[PDB]
Amino acid sequence: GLPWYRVHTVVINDPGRLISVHLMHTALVAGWAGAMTLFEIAVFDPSDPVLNPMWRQGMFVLPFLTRLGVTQSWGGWTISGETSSNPGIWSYEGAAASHIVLSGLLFLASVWHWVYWDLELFRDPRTGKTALDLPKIFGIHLFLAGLLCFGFGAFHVTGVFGPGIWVSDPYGLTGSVQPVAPSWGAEGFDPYNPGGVPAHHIAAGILGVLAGLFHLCVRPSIRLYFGLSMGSIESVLSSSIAAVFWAAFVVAGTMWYGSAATPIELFGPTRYQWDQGFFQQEIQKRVAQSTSEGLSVSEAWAKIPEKLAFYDYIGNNPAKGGLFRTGAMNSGDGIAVGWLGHASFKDQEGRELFVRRMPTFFETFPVVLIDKDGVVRADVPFRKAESKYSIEQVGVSVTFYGGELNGLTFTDPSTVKKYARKAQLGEIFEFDRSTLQSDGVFRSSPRGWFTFGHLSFALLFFFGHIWHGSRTIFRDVFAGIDED
Amino acid sequence: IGTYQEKRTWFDDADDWLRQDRFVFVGWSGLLLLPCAYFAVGGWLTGCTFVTSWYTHGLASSYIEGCNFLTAAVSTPANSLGHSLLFVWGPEAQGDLTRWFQLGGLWAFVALHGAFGLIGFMLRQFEIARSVNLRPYNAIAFSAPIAVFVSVFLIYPLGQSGWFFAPSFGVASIFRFILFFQGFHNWTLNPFHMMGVAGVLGAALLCAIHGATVENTLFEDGDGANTFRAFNPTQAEETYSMVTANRFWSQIFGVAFSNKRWLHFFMLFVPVTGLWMSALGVVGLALNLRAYDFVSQEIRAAEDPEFETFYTKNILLNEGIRAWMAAQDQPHEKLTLPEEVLPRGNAL
Amino acid sequence: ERPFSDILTSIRYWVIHSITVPSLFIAGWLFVSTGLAYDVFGSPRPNEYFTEDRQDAPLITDRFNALEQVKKLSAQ
């Protein structure tokens, strides 16, 4: 009989049961969305939006809820740290419940379409043979998709009727769901410009409506009909699989490189902000300013936002995790309790030294203290027998500015060494590790996990598209070639 | 186009000429394959012969610089260029072909033209299979080297900081890439790589064992000690005894194929599956999602100085690789690490 | 057509190619020996890998001015 890998072919020539299995799949996906939201609400801790944000807790669908405007819960808290006294129906739990109800309704509809598969609608009027008018079906679907895209761009994200979308400052400090005005110039194609999203959706929805009307009207040519096999649903399957792995590559690249639709307050920092000194440069600029204005170094480091200092920690890099280092980053290095303050190192004569930061590639990195001009002045030796740059002989002290350690100077060896090793990772924080039994190795962020899953799905779907395009083009020889 | 009078057009004339049976089949896919593949191969040869790596990597990588075939390479661009496409008209080269060669734009040229040449060759497989009315399993099998090329030369550098960390087209540069993955990713410990190695080695085993089995289970089919003359291509009988081959392998190995079609599909299946698994692993490595460590073993080693495994020895070796490789391998990092901080062993 | 062994065993082929093939070989020899290879492909000559200013390997650190950066870090 059928091989196990061909069972679902039984609904190729059954449009009613194709609708039924589509409805069952949609029910499963909606039920997953609801159940995942409920799980993440059950395990989410909203106590500290600054040092324990959602991307430190392994929240995967919670950022996607927060991105489009759902920011309150029925538990009385808001994702931005305020109190929600009127969360309304559309809270996190409300969206979860709506998805569960949708899943149940789609399950019932799937049952009905499985049973009542033999509909006159699926019979052609002339020959009495089961046929789907795939060009007109595509026209209808494209028209509906254009309407939905235009409505989402013109009413939801503009905020004229919907709530808007999440918009933040470039350094991810404030963060809020705001209405967004569309950008109709070249700036609308700036991918970090939030105004590009409404403009894209409005323009592409108008184009989708017009193209759907075109496909509703104009019949395909006979040459293109035979060349693309528009009478076969498997050709549509191959082209749809092509479109979805194209889109999967696009969304994986967008998530990994960052854009206006992947805010760092929801998904975590990118690896390129660590690899290009984004937050480090901003912190150093904010300290350099208000130093020319006469404040000391203990001040203007206490003015540095602790969230901004937390963004400058390589443990928040999405590219420091592992394939089998599972779960939340809090389970990896601990829940951040407080910023210990900026660590400034100096040698015995007076020059300032800086710890060479760990690059993204290196699991382990040697501790090196370099001076202003780029000359290595101190290190933690691997060979401490005839060393000549050890912290003990260079006489390196560390002074802290702006944290729980502020103004406290350490001249003792091995405490200069522990704070230098912690300064290798960026800004230094204290971590509660007994709450979740953290193992000490870095985890990946939801940004990294999303990128991994969708790149893998994109390649697998490239293979699927190859297989189905080949199946459509070579259908007449699927069971074998002629004897000739 | 059916039993209908369609009338001929320039498309029909072009199709008639392109699908004509000649010394080299062009087809519609040839218009993509032949220039792109020609340019990729010629660009790699040109880069190995004349183009230097002195400004991108600080290396000699050309025959004109004194490198041999194993040492010359078309090297990746400098990491400060990131993932720039490096068109010759692009903002970096700005039309200057010599500076485009110096800036590493030939790597991007070769990589992109090679990717489109792979696409064109797959389309050529599809087109020729459709013309001869055969099933497209050759293109289905060729999907796996394309997956490897995409994941290794595009997806991995796109996940890293730039094309600089892609493999450079050349023998010793590939060896650099391999040792770099060992040291920085512990790529041997990765289960997807393990599945890929199993697929490649099992496919080599299958090729050898099937060729030997056919050649040693042959029917006589003619007098003469040269058996290669006992086969006529226009014949309708098997040339080797499947029954005898099955008996032999059942009594030697325990199991044996009894289905020729299943055997040949298995020969297709093993290397393609292995290469796809390895491609998925490289996609994981593009985000530094490595199977680098076993955390329980690291904890056990940290709380017990007498616990050593080959895994811990390999972790030490990887640390040595990274530390002694980084300064010369990543010039953009500007790493000048004094010898005293380099991890070493006793008297070696 | 012609089955290419008839081509490879024809005096017309060999009297064409005893002129064409050595001319191409000499053209490649002159391309390397006259320095046109260095001029075209930008590979430094053995005496101009280092200048008086820098005695180490070059490093392209700018992207949007990489053209003038490699012009000033190259062998003039």
Binding site: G277, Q280 | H332 | -
Partner: peptide, 27 residues
């Protein structure tokens, strides 16, 4: 405000910042 000293602040800690990989032709 002193852009050269903040560039020199970023230099030793990290050698791939945009502050030092951009406009580094006059240096």
């Amino acid at each position: 405000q002193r852009v050269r000293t903040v560039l020199d602040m970023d230099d030793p800690a990290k050698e791939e910042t945009v502050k030092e990989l951009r406009k580094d032709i006059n240096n």
